[PDB]
């Protein structure tokens, strides 16, 4: 079972190990051009914005077996989350869709 809080936590761990990041580039087995370029700063700023959106959610929505479902039955909740996080209604549905795809593969993991 992959909840929205679970996704929140994975995002924290991924951001944390980001810097760190130098050591990771000094280990073989990752093929050619491992982390080059250069889109690790923008990529992390994205996870942080999704985290701020989930900061507007409550415990029921966060620990729900299917957080996306809690918003399908009560679309009023979507409006609140968007208000509190300074984001648009579409942005919250996007996060919800992404969470759906994330949770699908986690059980497929």
């Amino acid at each position: 079972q992959f909840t929205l809080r679970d996704m929140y936590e994975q995002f924290q761990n991924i951001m944390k190990m980001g810097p760190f990041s130098q050591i990771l580039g000094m280990i073989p087995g990752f093929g050619t051009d491992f982390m080059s370029k250069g889109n690790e700063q923008e990529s992390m700023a994205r996870l942080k914005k999704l985290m701020t959106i989930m900061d507007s959610m409550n415990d029921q929505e966060l620990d729900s077996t299917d957080g996306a479902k809690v918003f399908s039955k009560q679309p009023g909740r979507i409006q609140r989350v968007a208000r509190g996080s300074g984001v648009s209604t579409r942005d919250v549905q996007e996060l919800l869709t992404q969470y759906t795809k994330f949770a699908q593969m986690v059980k497929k993991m």
Binding site: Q10, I14, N39, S43, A45, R46, L47, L50, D91, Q98
Partner: peptide, 18 residues
């Protein structure tokens, strides 16, 4: 793990314009 987790994290930030 590092691939998807990092790649999904990456793919998400780009797609979500705000």
């Amino acid at each position: 793990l590092g691939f998807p987790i990092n790649f999904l994290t990456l793919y998400v930030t780009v797609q979500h314009k705000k």
